[PDB]
Design a protein around this ligand. Sequence first.
Ligand SMILES: [Mg+2]
Lengths: 127, 127, 128, 146, 146, 146
Amino acid sequence: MQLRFARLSEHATAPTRGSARAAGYDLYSAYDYTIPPMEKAVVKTDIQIALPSGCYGRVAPRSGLAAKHFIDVGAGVIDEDYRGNVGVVLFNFGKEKFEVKKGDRIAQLICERIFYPEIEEVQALDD
Amino acid sequence: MQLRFARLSEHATAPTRGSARAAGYDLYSAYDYTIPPMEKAVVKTDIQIALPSGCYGRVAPRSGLAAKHFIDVGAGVIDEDYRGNVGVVLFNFGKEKFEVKKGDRIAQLICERIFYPEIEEVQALDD
Amino acid sequence: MQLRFARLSEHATAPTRGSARAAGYDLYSAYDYTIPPMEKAVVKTDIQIALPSGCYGRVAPRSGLAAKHFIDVGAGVIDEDYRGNVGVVLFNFGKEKFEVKKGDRIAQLICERIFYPEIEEVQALDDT
Amino acid sequence: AELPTHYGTIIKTLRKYMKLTQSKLSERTGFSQNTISNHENGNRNIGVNEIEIYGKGLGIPSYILHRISDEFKEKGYSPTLNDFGKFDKMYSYVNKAYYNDGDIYYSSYDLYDETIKLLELLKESKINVNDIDYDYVLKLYKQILS
Amino acid sequence: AELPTHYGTIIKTLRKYMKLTQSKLSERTGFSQNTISNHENGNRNIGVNEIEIYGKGLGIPSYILHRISDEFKEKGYSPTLNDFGKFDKMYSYVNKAYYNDGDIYYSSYDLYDETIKLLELLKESKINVNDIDYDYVLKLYKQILS
Amino acid sequence: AELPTHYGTIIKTLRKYMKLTQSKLSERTGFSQNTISNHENGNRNIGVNEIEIYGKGLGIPSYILHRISDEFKEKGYSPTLNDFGKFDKMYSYVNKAYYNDGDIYYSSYDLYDETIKLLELLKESKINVNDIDYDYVLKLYKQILS
Ligand SMILES: [Mg+2]
């Protein structure tokens, strides 16, 4: 399948991908946020997604923001059925504040392929 | 695909999954822990697992704990052959203390599908 | 398939993997670094990689460094086409300083299998 | 180790609640009606891995059957299983809300408890469960998460 | 629900820039030659998802077509589309640099703007583009990222 | 570029340690028994990537063969390759311990060095390696990681 999305507001940017073989689609903030040092923000994108089958959506860090402004992405598991507003949990681990403006790139969305396995209890497992 | 597990003590909860298409199985603590602010704990689950072949187990963060209490998951690669006690390395980056009680949900276990490729040195790679 | 790499300098160690079914290849630093507490360093490996098709490279944490010295790995997405020097963005969240010596293992490289899907905008999606 | 006997009561009550016969459940689970009987009637104990099958057979997430058992292990009885209709109704809103609203999705800790908190807040406000709708329950849900 | 008209002009100009005939693009994208003509001539508006097709047909990242449109929505015209050759030249250096040099890969924010910053820095220094090489541009690029 | 000559000595010693003949190695993971003999005799150098093949053939993780070479590059000889039996015994405990115990799994840095540290700790305590059991070595192992 494909990655279907839908704008939830006037303020959302469509996810973009630069190369044909780039790991993730870029996610853009829909609002202005000021994250204090050593603090966290749930940045809303105002888009809803439906991931292709056989994968979940990993909200992954941008290497730029990480190496230069000490920005990580907390949480970041998007379920196959999550149909609400995709949010990006940003951790600012820097000494200064970090400034999110609408239309800024703050993460990428990778379609991590996973199994959906059946759980089965046993007495013990052979070491 | 099946995910066989085994209880290592009376104190372990069986891994649970809400939806049939949810990204990971919930992992529950087996003990009480108090993680001071800006500190870390290896939370034992008292379960051992055997993952389906062609994947590893990623101990991923819960979106709630991350957005509201600034809780991340350090480390988190579970090898295919790891047969010991699945532990979850928790980072408390918040300003307050964070309280883990037995039976709390502290992570999810995703079966990330990966390749196991053979390594091959070259003089250089064509860009 | 195969994971081709190439040394970019005299100082690089070839990626190694312990078990035949281990999740990632070990990545070794090519230099000494002293990371202050609550600070970060992009540890250069002086190797370039080309990943097998249908996956990207995740630079993932080593469980030891994380549980014992509070060391996390920032960033860590290596695109299929990245042909430059593989670097590992190390976060030292400990109270002391952390010491990277040349030839130290500082991360692992997992071949995360992913889709490369085509995007398609819709008016709205039927809610679950 | 095998499972407590009250899982028989739990499976039995919920069978009668989903208007399912032992024969219909026998087709879904694959167990003989005799096996289901001795399980429900308390004669033999249900294996750890058989509850997952029953959950599919009954169409109730096996996750929930244990949370009901947890109420037997503590209170002696299960108030959720007692008035399970009000629970099934609320849980489905709590679920829908979790998978469709970001405030809930990035804030919920455990849907099961949140459903109970919601049913207790409705009893405290003297409001029936089949009198409120998904949109109203969401407003309430969002308050209890801050 | 449809896209502005200027996407026709954009597709048209860039078609003429990649020295591609309407018939050649008709097989590259899969749109009938009439569809492309009414699209380029401003007669019918391009669907939201058809631009990705055009980008592949043209061999220009669809990500870029929108960044050009962003310039029409603001300035009224598009200076990038005006002197698109100097852009394509620089963008290909910026790209090569991002995908082959670690300082750029672990530092770049958005390749499009960085290309524009670089073209504006060369205009301020009165240097033509066919006087600089990849190695000269890289040195400059690395400075503008600190 | 080809690999140092001592990899021949390493391949030879480890062949005799796994009771494997040159023709057996050619049938397991080799091109010709004559090629393998000229590599071991030092007349031909093993290619950079041929070591991985040899490792599977011998049934020793190729990761370890290079760590032995590292000891030639420094010490001039390889004491590990000298008394490799005591190593193989300890390594197999270290491995089992790493993959089965959380304290080891979430604390180890490098299995190879840890095996050497452990063999050196037994030499300091004058304890034979074929006299201690897996459970004894684990107790020591966890100490050397604290
Ligand atoms: Mg993290």
